[PDB]
Structure 1
Amino acid sequence: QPEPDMITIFIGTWNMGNAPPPKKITSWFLSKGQGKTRDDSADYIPHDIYVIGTQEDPLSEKEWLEILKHSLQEITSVTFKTVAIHTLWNIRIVVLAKPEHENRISHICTDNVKTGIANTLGNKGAVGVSFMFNGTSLGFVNSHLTSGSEKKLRRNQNYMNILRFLALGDKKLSPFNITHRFTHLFWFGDLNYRVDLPTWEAETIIQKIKQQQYADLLSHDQLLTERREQKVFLHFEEEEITFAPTYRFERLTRDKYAYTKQKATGMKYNLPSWCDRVLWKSYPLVHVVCQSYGSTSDIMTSDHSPVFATFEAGVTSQFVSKNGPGTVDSQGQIEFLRCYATLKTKSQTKFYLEFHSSCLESFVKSQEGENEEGSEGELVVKFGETLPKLKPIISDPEYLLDQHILISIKSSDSDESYGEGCIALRLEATETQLPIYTPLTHHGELTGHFQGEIKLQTSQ
């Protein structure tokens, strides 16, 4: 049985509105309804992994697991294994996988983050799951962010608290948050960003939706606009939205948007919005292709419609040579030339680099770089030719070219990371000086850049 080099992953997000689901929810798992939908010819083909995020979920874990497993059995005739389930209040994540993957999956982690302080702590936040699939790390975040059209800044704060404090993936990657820990990171949920148009335009917006004319509405979508201004979800991708707003519907139909202010809404308008979203971030030059992104039309127990997204995701095998794991392979090396970091920091301290990768027996600390002033005020940290030679555990190019090097730039004075980034070893050539580049972030905010040249030696 050959190990896969691709899997397909189903991501679902549904705010259930504290109501039980209807008897049939198979359209969700089949990616049928509005938007970018799955071909009918694929209906019996199981995805490898199903990741289900709910919000306002009134069910016990047992009740929901029984509905999900029975649903997938009806669609695929496969009895899925439970990889993980984690619930914070009414926010839940379930990961299900095909039985053949049971032994390919390891290092399962779960965590949650509660957002807000006093007033604002009690029902919003995130749950997450990570695991290894053979040689590939996968992270999944289901978040329910602050509601309300006039709280986009709060949502962006909730996002930064979640990506700082959610403890998933390899703890040895201590300088790195979840936005660097995984080959593929999927972040979904009721993110609660709204279409930011005047209240008086409610009926105009509904008109536009009925005509399937989403362009003038998406130009005011707060997640698209906040992302464009680098206020949230920096370096994440989202597929084009081609489905109607998934909030706020009258229950038991999809023919009516319930937008008017009510005591029950805190006298807030809920203009039709794309509250329910799926985003991802994969390491550079890994295969990831969105194959569906849409909403169901036939599940109407909630004031939200379920959203689905599916992905092809590249995966690698658990590589064993005669040498590594358990030693280095002297036929392999990674060299760095003409390297410098450019930092936005106003501080003057010395910096060094840390290199972290599962291709190394452990992380590597560089010597201190030499600080200079950039021509436009920047701090430039010059490493020149001074960075160490990295010694990978396996020199075989079929392994090494699929690997990545995480970089942290740290203060000598405090050992705190000022910036994190990632370099792919999927090079155009080996034994050849080639340009490398990564933006650097800290707490998911841009803090600088790292650039230079790499020289990769493999056994070929």
Structure 2
Amino acid sequence: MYTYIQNFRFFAGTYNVNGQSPKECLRLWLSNGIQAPDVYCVGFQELDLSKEAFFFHDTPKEEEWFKAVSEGLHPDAKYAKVKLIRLVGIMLLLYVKQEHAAYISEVEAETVGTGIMGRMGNKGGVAIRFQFHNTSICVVNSHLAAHIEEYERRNQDYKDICSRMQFCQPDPSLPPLTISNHDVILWLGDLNYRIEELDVEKVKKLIEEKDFQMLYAYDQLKIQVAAKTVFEGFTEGELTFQPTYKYDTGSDDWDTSEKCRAPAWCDRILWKGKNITQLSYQSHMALKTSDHKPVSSVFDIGVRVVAHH
């Protein structure tokens, strides 16, 4: 027989829920204005901010946000859960259309904590790798170090997730599988890279002027990726939406606190691999449950399908 490449719809989502429980229907983020995707990749940050969850215990939030996502998915297709992985507050969900599950194999799920003392799960990354038909796919949900001046820590947090994240393969003699050893790599999550140089007022004025081209010129990730310190070989879509950090819970008004935190593109989606075509890169202003806004991305990814007779 022979193999050909078939395009599939992949959904990629990130949402920092800031220890909150779902108080809004997740249809606005997961299936509003889109065709039913073939594969769903739903990542989260700060799922539970309690002491109990921090000491690696279980949480009611896991099921709370799992039911909310399942219901929020596209109603035109029946979805089957492939895997669920969670490190403290960092979660990553994988769903496929029932019709695709038979062609899903070699599923692995690993966690890497890069937080307090570079080992705790407060900040780190979770990942689900699998094989859809004849193509190896790895999805990473990372929550890198917080605050503006901590850009060198964020670069190290990326290098840590990359070097420690190893998935077991069938051949034990072969070197362990790392994120880089995959046909398709989708990296999402709260990367926390802020906006440098500019004053809090200059950042807010640029968003009012809707001049995201000028604001992006000072984006810490863009600067670090150019310096070849992070996401080497990775691509990111043009930011057409306003920064998703920091809002007042229940509104679209910027942080009105003693801190008065300056806006930043904290939640990003980046890919690496052959046959990937990004169809969209949006933010969802409608969901006010957190101080962050959910970010989505829909791709047209090529998968090697076997042609029998």
For 1:128 and 1:213, how far apart are their aligned partners in 2?
A: 34
Corresponding residue for residue 227 of structure 2: 229
1:73-88 mapped onto 2 (5 Å cutoff): 75-88=74-87
Higher relative contact order (CA 8 A, sep 6+): 2
| 1:158 correspondence with 2:146 | no
**Structure 1 counterpart SS, 2:83:** strand
**Structure 2 counterpart SS, 1:272:** coil
Corresponding residue for residue 272 of structure 1: 263
1:62-81 mapped onto 2 (5 Å cutoff): 62-72=63-73, 75-81=74-80
Kept in 1: contact 2:21–2:61 (CA 8 A): no
Task: Identify unmatched segments of 5+ residues in structure 2.
Answer: 49-59
For 1:153 and 1:86, how far apart are their aligned partners in 2?
A: 27
Structure with more of its chain in helix, by fraction = 2
The 1:270–1:4 alpha-carbon spacing in structure 2 relative to 1, beyond 3 Å, is: same
Corresponding residue for residue 303 of structure 1: 291
Paired AA for residue 47 in structure 2: D
For 2:229 and 2:4, how far apart are their aligned partners in 1?
A: 40
Paired AA for residue 235 in structure 2: E
| 1:184 correspondence with 2:184 | yes
Corresponding residue for residue 423 of structure 1: none
The 1:119–1:127 alpha-carbon spacing in structure 2 relative to 1, beyond 3 Å, is: closer
Q: Which has the higher mean CA deviation after the structures are superposed, 240-249 or 55-64?
A: 55-64
For 1:156 and 1:170, how far apart are their aligned partners in 2?
A: 28
For 1:77 and 1:107, how far apart are their aligned partners in 2?
A: 28
Deviations 1:420-454 (A, max 9, x none): xxxxxxxxxxxxxxxxxxxxxxxxxxxxxxxxxxx
Aligned partner (choices 43, 51, 65) of residue 53 of structure 1: 43
Deviations 1:394-439 (A, max 9, x none): xxxxxxxxxxxxxxxxxxxxxxxxxxxxxxxxxxxxxxxxxxxxxx
Kept in 1: contact 2:113–2:119 (CA 8 A): no
Kept in 2: contact 1:110–1:168 (CA 8 A): yes
Corresponding residue for residue 195 of structure 1: 195
For 1:212 and 1:120, how far apart are their aligned partners in 2?
A: 40
For 1:287 and 1:227, how far apart are their aligned partners in 2?
A: 22
Kept in 1: contact 2:166–2:176 (CA 8 A): no
Kept in 1: contact 2:81–2:94 (CA 8 A): yes
Corresponding residue for residue 255 of structure 2: 258
Structure-1-length-normalised TM-score: 0.60
For 1:182 and 1:122, how far apart are their aligned partners in 2?
A: 25
Task: Identify unmatched segments of 5+ residues in structure 1.
Answer: 33-39, 263-268, 322-460
Kept in 2: contact 1:135–1:318 (CA 8 A): yes
Kept in 2: contact 1:169–1:182 (CA 8 A): no
The 1:209–1:217 alpha-carbon spacing in structure 2 relative to 1, beyond 3 Å, is: same
The 1:169–1:275 alpha-carbon spacing in structure 2 relative to 1, beyond 3 Å, is: farther
1:32-181 mapped onto 2 (5 Å cutoff): 40=33, 43=34, 45-58=35-48, 60-72=61-73, 75-116=74-115, 118=117, 121-168=120-167, 170=169, 172=171, 173-174=174-175, 177-179=178-180, 181=181
For 1:188 and 1:259, how far apart are their aligned partners in 2?
A: 28
Structure-2-length-normalised TM-score: 0.89
For 1:253 and 1:318, how far apart are their aligned partners in 2?
A: 50
Kept in 1: contact 2:18–2:290 (CA 8 A): yes
Aligned-pair Cα RMSD in Å: 2.2
1:330-345 mapped onto 2 (5 Å cutoff): none
Paired AA for residue 251 in structure 2: T
For 1:122 and 1:184, how far apart are their aligned partners in 2?
A: 26
Paired AA for residue 139 in structure 2: F
**Structure 1 counterpart SS, 2:47:** coil
For 1:114 and 1:55, how far apart are their aligned partners in 2?
A: 13
The 1:119–1:166 alpha-carbon spacing in structure 2 relative to 1, beyond 3 Å, is: closer
Deviations 1:198-225 (A, max 9, x none): 4xx2122112112211122111100000
Kept in 1: contact 2:15–2:189 (CA 8 A): yes
Q: For this pair of structures, how many residues does the alignment match? A: 294
Paired AA for residue 255 in structure 2: A
Kept in 2: contact 1:13–1:54 (CA 8 A): yes
Kept in 1: contact 2:191–2:266 (CA 8 A): yes
Deviations 1:151-188 (A, max 9, x none): 00000000001011112364745176312x11100011
1:111 deviates by 0.4
